[PDB]
Coordinates of all heavy atoms in Angstrom, one line a residue:
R1081 N -10.3 36.7 -6.7 CA -8.8 36.9 -6.5 C -8.0 36.2 -7.6 O -6.7 36.3 -7.6 CB -8.4 36.3 -5.2 CG -9.0 37.0 -4.0 CD -8.4 36.5 -2.7 NE -8.2 35.0 -2.7 CZ -7.0 34.4 -2.8 NH1 -5.9 35.1 -2.9 NH2 -7.0 33.1 -2.8
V1082 N -8.6 35.6 -8.6 CA -7.8 34.9 -9.7 C -7.6 35.7 -10.9 O -8.4 36.6 -11.3 CB -8.5 33.6 -10.0 CG1 -8.5 32.6 -8.8 CG2 -9.8 33.8 -10.6
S1083 N -6.6 35.4 -11.7 CA -6.3 36.0 -13.0 C -7.3 35.3 -14.0 O -7.9 34.3 -13.7 CB -4.9 35.8 -13.4 OG -4.5 34.4 -13.4
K1084 N -7.4 35.9 -15.2 CA -8.3 35.4 -16.2 C -7.8 34.0 -16.7 O -8.7 33.1 -16.9 CB -8.4 36.4 -17.4 CG -8.9 35.8 -18.6 CD -9.0 36.8 -19.8 CE -9.6 36.2 -21.0 NZ -9.7 37.3 -22.1
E1085 N -6.5 33.8 -16.8 CA -6.0 32.6 -17.4 C -6.2 31.3 -16.5 O -6.6 30.3 -17.0 CB -4.5 32.7 -17.7 CG -3.7 33.3 -16.5 CD -2.2 33.3 -16.8 OE1 -1.5 32.3 -16.6 OE2 -1.7 34.3 -17.2
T1086 N -6.0 31.5 -15.2 CA -6.2 30.4 -14.3 C -7.6 29.9 -14.2 O -8.0 28.7 -14.3 CB -5.7 30.7 -12.9 OG1 -4.3 31.1 -12.9 CG2 -5.9 29.6 -11.9
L1087 N -8.5 30.9 -14.0 CA -9.9 30.7 -14.0 C -10.3 30.0 -15.3 O -11.1 29.1 -15.3 CB -10.7 32.0 -13.9 CG -12.2 31.9 -13.9 CD1 -12.7 30.8 -13.0 CD2 -12.9 33.3 -13.6
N1088 N -9.8 30.5 -16.4 CA -10.0 29.9 -17.7 C -9.6 28.4 -17.8 O -10.3 27.6 -18.4 CB -9.3 30.6 -18.8 CG -10.0 30.6 -20.2 OD1 -10.9 29.8 -20.4 ND2 -9.7 31.6 -21.0
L1089 N -8.5 28.1 -17.2 CA -8.0 26.7 -17.1 C -8.9 25.8 -16.2 O -9.0 24.6 -16.5 CB -6.6 26.7 -16.6 CG -5.5 27.3 -17.5 CD1 -4.1 27.1 -16.9 CD2 -5.6 26.7 -18.9
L1090 N -9.5 26.4 -15.2 CA -10.3 25.7 -14.2 C -11.8 25.6 -14.5 O -12.6 24.9 -13.9 CB -10.1 26.2 -12.8 CG -8.7 26.1 -12.2 CD1 -8.6 26.8 -10.9 CD2 -8.3 24.6 -12.1
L1091 N -12.2 26.4 -15.5 CA -13.6 26.5 -15.9 C -14.4 25.2 -16.1 O -15.5 25.0 -15.6 CB -13.8 27.5 -17.1 CG -13.9 29.0 -16.9 CD1 -14.1 29.7 -18.2 CD2 -15.0 29.3 -15.8
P1092 N -13.8 24.3 -16.9 CA -14.6 23.0 -17.2 C -14.9 22.2 -15.9 O -15.9 21.5 -15.9 CB -13.6 22.3 -18.1 CG -12.9 23.3 -18.8 CD -12.6 24.4 -17.8
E1093 N -14.1 22.4 -14.9 CA -14.4 21.7 -13.6 C -15.4 22.5 -12.8 O -16.2 21.9 -12.1 CB -13.0 21.5 -12.9 CG -12.1 20.6 -13.6 CD -10.8 20.4 -12.8 OE1 -10.6 21.2 -11.8 OE2 -10.0 19.6 -13.2
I1094 N -15.3 23.8 -12.8 CA -16.1 24.7 -12.0 C -17.6 24.7 -12.4 O -18.5 24.6 -11.6 CB -15.6 26.1 -11.9 CG1 -14.2 26.2 -11.4 CG2 -16.5 27.0 -11.1 CD1 -13.5 27.5 -11.7
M1095 N -17.8 24.8 -13.7 CA -19.1 25.0 -14.3 C -20.2 24.0 -14.0 O -21.4 24.4 -13.7 CB -19.0 25.2 -15.8 CG -18.3 26.4 -16.3 SD -19.2 28.0 -15.6 CE -18.0 28.4 -14.1
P1096 N -19.9 22.7 -14.0 CA -21.0 21.7 -13.8 C -21.6 21.8 -12.4 O -22.8 21.7 -12.2 CB -20.2 20.3 -13.8 CG -19.1 20.6 -14.8 CD -18.7 22.0 -14.5
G1097 N -20.8 22.2 -11.4 CA -21.3 22.3 -10.0 C -22.2 23.5 -9.9 O -23.2 23.5 -9.2
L1098 N -21.9 24.6 -10.7 CA -22.7 25.8 -10.6 C -24.0 25.6 -11.4 O -25.1 26.1 -11.0 CB -22.0 27.0 -11.2 CG -20.8 27.4 -10.5 CD1 -20.2 28.6 -11.1 CD2 -21.1 27.7 -9.0
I1099 N -24.0 24.9 -12.5 CA -25.2 24.6 -13.2 C -26.1 23.6 -12.4 O -27.3 23.9 -12.3 CB -24.9 23.9 -14.6 CG1 -24.0 24.9 -15.4 CG2 -26.2 23.6 -15.3 CD1 -24.6 26.3 -15.5
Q1100 N -25.6 22.6 -11.9 CA -26.4 21.6 -11.2 C -26.9 22.2 -9.9 O -28.0 22.0 -9.4 CB -25.6 20.3 -10.8 CG -26.4 19.2 -10.3 CD -25.6 18.0 -9.9 OE1 -24.4 17.9 -10.1 NE2 -26.3 17.0 -9.3
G1101 N -26.1 23.1 -9.3 CA -26.5 23.8 -8.1 C -27.6 24.8 -8.5 O -28.4 25.1 -7.7
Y1102 N -27.5 25.3 -9.7 CA -28.5 26.2 -10.2 C -29.8 25.5 -10.4 O -30.9 26.0 -10.3 CB -28.1 26.8 -11.6 CG -28.7 28.2 -11.9 CD1 -28.1 28.9 -12.9 CD2 -29.8 28.7 -11.3 CE1 -28.6 30.2 -13.2 CE2 -30.3 29.9 -11.6 CZ -29.7 30.7 -12.6 OH -30.2 31.9 -12.9
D1103 N -29.7 24.1 -10.5 CA -30.9 23.3 -10.6 C -31.3 22.8 -9.2 O -32.3 22.0 -9.1 CB -30.8 22.2 -11.6 CG -30.9 22.7 -13.0 OD1 -31.7 23.6 -13.3 OD2 -30.2 22.1 -13.9
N1104 N -30.6 23.2 -8.2 CA -30.9 22.7 -6.8 C -32.3 23.2 -6.4 O -32.7 24.3 -6.7 CB -29.8 23.1 -5.9 CG -29.9 22.4 -4.5 OD1 -31.0 22.0 -4.1 ND2 -28.8 22.2 -3.9
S1105 N -32.9 22.4 -5.5 CA -34.3 22.8 -5.0 C -34.2 23.9 -4.0 O -35.2 24.5 -3.7 CB -34.9 21.5 -4.4 OG -34.2 21.0 -3.3
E1106 N -33.0 24.1 -3.4 CA -32.8 25.0 -2.3 C -32.5 26.4 -2.9 O -31.6 26.6 -3.7 CB -31.7 24.6 -1.3 CG -32.1 23.4 -0.5 CD -33.2 23.7 0.5 OE1 -33.4 24.8 0.9 OE2 -33.8 22.7 1.0
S1107 N -33.3 27.4 -2.6 CA -33.2 28.7 -3.1 C -31.9 29.4 -2.9 O -31.3 30.1 -3.8 CB -34.3 29.7 -2.5 OG -34.1 31.0 -3.0
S1108 N -31.3 29.2 -1.7 CA -30.0 29.8 -1.4 C -28.9 29.3 -2.3 O -28.1 30.1 -2.8 CB -29.6 29.5 0.0 OG -30.6 30.0 0.9
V1109 N -28.9 28.0 -2.7 CA -27.9 27.4 -3.5 C -28.0 28.0 -4.9 O -27.0 28.3 -5.5 CB -28.0 25.9 -3.5 CG1 -27.1 25.3 -4.6 CG2 -27.7 25.3 -2.2
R1110 N -29.3 28.1 -5.4 CA -29.5 28.7 -6.7 C -29.0 30.1 -6.8 O -28.3 30.5 -7.7 CB -31.0 28.7 -7.1 CG -31.6 27.3 -7.1 CD -33.1 27.4 -7.6 NE -33.9 28.1 -6.6 CZ -35.3 28.1 -6.7 NH1 -35.9 27.5 -7.6 NH2 -36.0 28.7 -5.7

């Protein structure tokens, strides 16, 4: 539901959680 600019502004905060979650042991989280 977000515009490109806002997501762009929030990206540095969002990304670490997704990457570390991507490294999570639980398949659903990945």
Side-chain angles (χ1 to χ4, degrees):
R1081 299 185 316 108
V1082 299
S1083 57
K1084 163 182 185 174
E1085 50 175 274
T1086 298
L1087 176 52
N1088 211 339
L1089 293 182
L1090 296 175
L1091 273 183
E1093 294 179 352
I1094 303 167
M1095 291 302 100
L1098 296 182
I1099 301 308
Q1100 190 183 354
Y1102 206 162
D1103 282 330
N1104 192 330
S1105 60
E1106 291 292 339
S1107 174
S1108 302
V1109 173
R1110 299 185 293 190

